[PDB]
Structure formats: C-alpha cells, structure tokens
Amino acid sequence: SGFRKMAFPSGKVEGCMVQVTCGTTTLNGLWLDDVVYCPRHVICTSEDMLNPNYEDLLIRKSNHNFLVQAGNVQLRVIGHSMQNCVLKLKVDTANPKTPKYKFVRIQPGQTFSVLACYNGSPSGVYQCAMRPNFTIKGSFLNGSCGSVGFNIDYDCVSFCYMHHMELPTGVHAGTDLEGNFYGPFVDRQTAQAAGTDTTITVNVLAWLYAAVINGDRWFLNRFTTTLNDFNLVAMKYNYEPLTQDHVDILGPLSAQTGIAVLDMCASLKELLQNGMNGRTILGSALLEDEFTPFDVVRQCSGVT
Amino acid sequence: SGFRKMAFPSGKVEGCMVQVTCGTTTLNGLWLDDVVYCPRHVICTSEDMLNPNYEDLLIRKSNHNFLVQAGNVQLRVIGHSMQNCVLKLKVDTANPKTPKYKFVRIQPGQTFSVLACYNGSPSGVYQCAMRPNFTIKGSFLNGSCGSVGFNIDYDCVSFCYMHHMELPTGVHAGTDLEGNFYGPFVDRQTAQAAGTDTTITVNVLAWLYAAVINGDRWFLNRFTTTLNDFNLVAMKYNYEPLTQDHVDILGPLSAQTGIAVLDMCASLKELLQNGMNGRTILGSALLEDEFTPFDVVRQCSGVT
Ligand SMILES: O[C@@H](Cc1cccc(Cl)c1)Cn1cncn1
Ligand SMILES: O[C@@H](Cc1cccc(Cl)c1)Cn1cncn1
C-alpha cells in the first residue's frame, strides 16, 4: 500500500548521458549505439538565439568542433547531421552501456520520467506528464538541455522527450528523439504561446481509483452520471472531455474495485463542484492528473 | 526554473539489488562488496511472523539455504550472520558494480530516495522524508522488503534505510543498514503504535523559499514574527518547534532571496491560520514538508 509519484529506475538512461560542447556552449547528449543525440542549439551563441539560421550555423562546424565526453572518455566524432531540432553526431565507438531502446512520440496526457542532467552528469529523476498543450512542468535550469524523458517496458527504454527550452512562463518545451517539437514551439528565444491547457480527466479518474485501492474512500458517493452530463462539468472546469476510449482504458481499475467508471465520474463531478472541503486524497489537496491508468495498475501490482 | 519532488538517479543502487530466497520467502537484498544485506524476516514463514524467535529460526538455516540471485548470476553464500534486524550473507564474489558507499543513520525530517524493488528487480524510484515519528509514507507492496533508501554525494551512496514492514495504518517502517529500526518498531506481525507525527517546519520554510525563487510569491506578506510567537502557532498546528539551528540551516536561502527567516515564518504563520484560499504553491494545495533546505539549494543550483 501507499501511492507515490514514482519515476522509472534511471540506471539504463544514466549510462547513455554525455556532455556535448560546441564553441562556448555545453549541454547534454544521449549516446545510443554509435550516435550521440543533442539539441541543435548547442551550435548557437547568445546572439544567435534571437532567430538562429541553424543551417548556416552548422555549416561553420566540422566534426572536430563537437566535443563529446562521457565522464572520463572522449568520443571521436566521425559525422554530424541535423534532423529537425536535433543533431546526430556519429561517433567511432558504440556505447557499451546502450540498453534495448526505441524512440517513441508520446501522446499528450501520457507520463514519463525525466533524468535531469547538467554537463552530462545526472542530477535527479522525476515523473511528469506531457500536458494536453504539449508543454511539461519540469525542473530544468540552464545547462539541462538535452536531458531526456523516457518510459521502460521490462528491459526496453522508450525515449520520448529531449529537453530544449524554458518558455518565458516557466513551463518547458522539447522534442521527440527525431527532433520534432511537441506543440507549436520553435527553438528561438522568442515569446511563444502555449495553447490553453486542460486537466487530464482519465488520469484524475485513474488516481481516484488508486485512492480507493489504497484506502482513501471519503469522496465516493451514492451518485452516478452519464458521459454527457459529466462532460458538461468537465467543460465548465477545463477538464478534457471523457470518451468511451478513456472509459475502456479504466476497465481494469473499474473491475478491480467494483466501482463502475460512470460512478467514479459522479465522485469526480462532486469534487469539481464542491472542492475537497479541506481534506486530502493520497496526500494531495488537489485533483492529481499525472498518473495514467497504466501507471496506477503498474504501481498497484508491483511491475519490475 | 520549476521545482519537482526529485529523486537521486538510482543507477548506482540498481547495480546492487539482488533477490534473496530462504525457504518459501523471497525478498530483496543489497549486494555491496562480498556481503548481501536483507531483512532478517526472509527466514520466517507466515506462522512465524506473529512472534518470531529469530535466533532459533536462523539456527535451522545453513549457508546453502540462502539463495541469492543477481538477475542471471547465482551467488555462492559462504557465511551468514544476523545483526539486529538484518542478515548479512557473505558471498564468494565481490559485486563488480559496488559503488563508493557509506551506511548512515538519518535523522527524522531528513529526506532520501527509495528504489522500490520486487524479486531483486527495480520497479521505481521516489523521494520521501523520514517522518518525525520515524515512519515513512512510501509505496510498498508485499515483496518490496529489502528495498533501500539512500542519498548520493557526488559518487558516494549513503544508504540510510532498508524496508521491513507495513504497519496496519498503511505507513512504512524499516531499519538503518545495521538492522536498527527507526522508531519503536519490531519486526513482528503485531499492531504497533507510531508516535504522534508533526509537520517538518524547517522543510516547509525551505519549500516556501523554493516557491519564491521559482516565481510563486503570493503568500509573502508585510509581517514579521519571532521564534517564540511562531512556535505558539507551530504548537497549535502540530508543526515541529523552530530552533536557531533550523534558522541557521535556512541562511543560504534567506541570503539568496533577501527574505529574512522570521519574515518567511510570518508568511507560514498566515498560511497556517488562513489556509491557501483555494490557491497553490509550486503545484501543491497544501504545505509541503518533504524538501530539506539542502534539497532546495541542490535543485535550485543544478548539483550533479
Ligand atoms: O531555455 C533554454 C535556452 C534556450 C532559449 C531559447 C530557445 C532554446 Cl531552444 C533554448 C535554457 N533552459 C532550458 N531549461 C531551462 N533553461
Ligand atoms: O509488512 C511486510 C510483511 C511483514 C509483516 C510483519 C512484520 C514484518 Cl518485519 C514484515 C510486507 N510489506 C512490506 N511493505 C508492504 N508490505
């Protein structure tokens, strides 16, 4: 029992972190097989970041200008190429610590672990969700660029995020491992609008199921609702509309607890309309949306 | 910017996890050098756990009864001994993945990362505090015994906790790596009183400093207080009394923000007496006490 905001064990990812320096700029790179992936803005100076012409800036760079160090070991760069907003530096040595891995583009509302790094050195690991507006609310300081987000399925690391930028609002933006930004963001020092965000309804319901499993039941009521009625309330409170696909994904939790998904929706409707009345759920005084139904099942069954 | 409940990178600890089986019971062990540490209750059956005579149960066990497996590798046990509530199984092979490490007994109110494991396999990592009453509010299911808590200082892992038990209240209890329980707990299936818990005042103030650093400032007011006056409020609200030693540890945060410790205490006094008024601080709707002043500085400066 007990329910915590748990990150995946980061060991397999720590083994891939390297420091990449180009000119005056140092950030983090991900060394998988004989390729090092890093944000393309490693080739910029401060004057370049207003509106960088990345193609022109990269043309002034040669393989020997990219300094890649994996702690002690210096990697020899034998090729470089830009793919979207990432650079791929081919090195002459395959990383001996390369785990089984995939590159995946996660959907908004999905969660992942971030291994925050500085100068190629891991500093901490935390779990977070990709917001519906494609930002993440992380903990990143200057130098954290190139830190990655990931999930693990037994022995396979699915890398889903590489950190690029902090928006003037303090929220974070980055790309998949092919260098495509999540959301409308561009890698420029420019004020950029993040869309209107919403609360991830399916995750809040998954979390209410985790609360019932772990003994927090005070919010359960004698009511039920419909998808239509619940969605009117979700609309008023800036929650994502609930679909049958979300109800379907909650099936295992519904079956385990015996609480029909629409009955949990009526508990969620009452919490939205009434608040928590100074009480808590799993140590939180607000409705938590950073646990997916999969995260709840995984944690409640002890998956390794 | 951004502030998250961050755990240490778990890689160095994942390399030490093993599975230990004795009879019908399997739990986790920590393999450091040529010794495997695990909870002594690995030698019990369900009938034994009401009031185990550990000395007698261990006398029926030989080195060959302790099955230690590090994933694929089977360790040969050449010695066994009980120290307090832990067993030390001497093995014939030093763990090649043994990091630089120390065994430390942490103080109540200090924080650490837990690597939750099942059958010797890491499942997740989360940060938590040792409550003032020596319990931890973790996420542990049956089979998680032997999972450890730790901190890292550059390349040194200080192991501070080994998980043993879940109390009937759903809170968790364990020992230091010498097998001494934190708190009054015994390793028996018996209802056991945890002391009255309090909120870790110094940590809440550290967290209010992290909030000001990261842009959440709404709670700052035009007031100040004294240690005596603040401690009357801390008393009413079951907060730990604040001492000059706590004010001293907050010195760096006070210097960085320019907010005198007693002025932050007046903000904390007003939040205790008035609540949050439906607002949040660093994404929380309650006063967070799981970040020490050291954790706040480390996170706000990007220490690796
Ligand atoms: O925002 C980053 C620098 C930068 C500026 C503008 C655009 C880009 Cl792609 C990068 C630094 N940073 C990342 N997390 C916290 N700080
Ligand atoms: O409580 C543990 C079993 C047990 C019972 C009684 C005493 C002891 Cl020392 C061990 C199982 N467990 C640990 N975390 C979650 N579940």
DSSP B151-217: EEETTEEEEEEEEEEE-TTS-EEEE-TTSPBSSS--SSSS--PPPPP-B-HHHHHHHHHHHHHTT--
Of the candidates B146, B16, B174, which has an alpha carbon nearest to the alpha carbon of residue B87? B146
Cβ-nearest to A2 among B139, B280, B302: B139
**In whole angstroms, what is the distance from residue B54 CA to residue B264 CA?**
50
Please give the structure tokens belonging to residue B163.
């998980």
Start-to-end Cα distance in chain B? 16
Distance from Cα B280 to the centre of ligand 2, integer Å:
36
**In whole angstroms, what is the distance from residue A199 CA to residue A272 CA?**
12
Pairing mode, strands A100-103 and A156-166? parallel
Q: What b/e string do you get for B23-47 counting C-beta neighbours within 10 Å, with b at 16 or more?
A: bebbbbbbbbebbbbbbbbbbbeee
Backbone CA torsion sign across B277, B279, B280, B281: negative
Please give the structure tokens belonging to residue A225.
């609702």
Same domain, A84 and A190: no
**In whole angstroms, what is the distance from residue A104 CA to residue A160 CA?**
5
Residue B90's SS3 state is strand
Same domain, A292 and A214: yes
Distance from Cα B14 to the centre of ligand 1, integer Å:
32
- Experimental approach was X-ray
The resolution, in Å, is 1.5
Same domain, B87 and B142: no
Q: What type of residue is A167?
A: L
Please give the structure tokens belonging to residue A9.
């064990």
What are A113's strand-pairing partners?
A127, A150
Query: How many distinct structural domains can be found in chain B?
Result: 3
Same domain, A5 and A147: yes
Of the candidates B154, B292, B168, which has an alpha carbon nearest to the alpha carbon of residue A122? B154
Same domain, B134 and B7: yes
Query: How many CB atoms are closer than 10 A to CB B81?
Result: 11
At how many degrees (to 10) do helices B261-274 and B201-213 cross?
100
- List chain A residues with CB under 8 Å of B140: 1-2
**In whole angstroms, what is the distance from residue B126 CA to residue B117 CA?**
12
Same domain, A1 and A138: yes
Residue of B nearest to A153 (CA): B123
**In whole angstroms, what is the distance from residue A290 CA to residue A4 CA?**
11
Same domain, B168 and B54: no
Same domain, B285 and B211: yes
Q: In what order do the strands lie in the sheet with A35-39?
A: A73-75, A66-70, A17-22, A25-32, A35-39, A86-91, A77-83
Residues A275, A265: contact at Cβ < 8 Å? no
Same domain, A202 and A93: no
DSSP A101-143: EEE--PPTT-EEEEEEEETTEEEEEEEEE--TTS-B-----TT
A244 by Cβ neighbours in 10 Å (0-12 / 13-18 / 19+) ranks as exposed
Are A1 and B116 in contact (CB < 8 Å)? no
Answer with the one of A99, A118, A149 that is the final residue of a domain: A99
Q: What b/e string do you get for B96-113 counting C-beta neighbours within 10 Å, with b at 16 or more?
A: ebbbebeebebebbbbbb
Are B7 and A128 in contact (CB < 8 Å)? no
Separation in Å, CA B120 to CA A179, A285, B90, B141: 36, 34, 17, 14
Query: C-alpha B35: how far from its chain's center?
Result: 22
Answer with the one of B175, B197, B219 that is the final residue of a domain: B197
Same domain, A206 and A261: yes
Same domain, A203 and A296: yes
Query: Which single residue is written with the structure tokens 């009054």?
Result: B184
Q: What type of residue is B147?
A: S
Are B170 and A278 in contact (CB < 8 Å)? no
**In whole angstroms, what is the distance from residue A263 CA to residue A268 CA?**
9
Of the candidates A26, A174, A14, A172, which has an alpha carbon nearest to the alpha carbon of residue B304? A14
The CATH number of residue A247's host domain is 1.10.1840.10
Phi, psi of A248 (to 5 degrees): -60, -45
Answer with the one of A158, A175, A197 that is the final residue of a domain: A197
Instruction: Look up residue B8 and give its DSSP letter.
Output: P
Same domain, A90 and A108: no
Instruction: Count Cα neighbours of B296 within 13 Å in the Cβ-side half-sphere.
Output: 28
Q: Which residues, other chains included, contact B283 with Cβ-Cβ below 8 Å and sequence gap of 6+?
A: A137, A286
Closest C-alpha residue for ligand 2 atom 10: B165
Query: How many CB atoms are closer than 10 A to CB A241?
Result: 13
Q: What b/e string do you get for B223-244 counting C-beta neighbours within 10 Å, with b at 16 or more?
A: eebebeebbebbeebebbebee
Which entry of B16, B22, B38, B41 is annotated as an active-site residue?
A: B41
The CATH number of residue A42's host domain is 2.40.10.10
**In whole angstroms, what is the distance from residue B173 CA to residue B191 CA?**
12
Query: C-alpha A22: how far from its chain's center?
Result: 26
Residue B97's SS3 state is coil
Separation in Å, CA A213 to CA A176, A183, B54, B166: 34, 35, 33, 15
- List chain A residues with CB under 8 Å of B283: 137, 286
Residue A21: domain span: 15-99
Of the candidates B77, B46, B84, which has an alpha carbon nearest to the alpha carbon of residue B62? B77
Question: Can you list the pairs that B53-57 forms with residues at least 24 positions away whose Cβ atoms lie under 8 Å?
Answer: B54/B82, B54/B187, B55/B82
**In whole angstroms, what is the distance from residue A44 CA to residue A25 CA?**
7
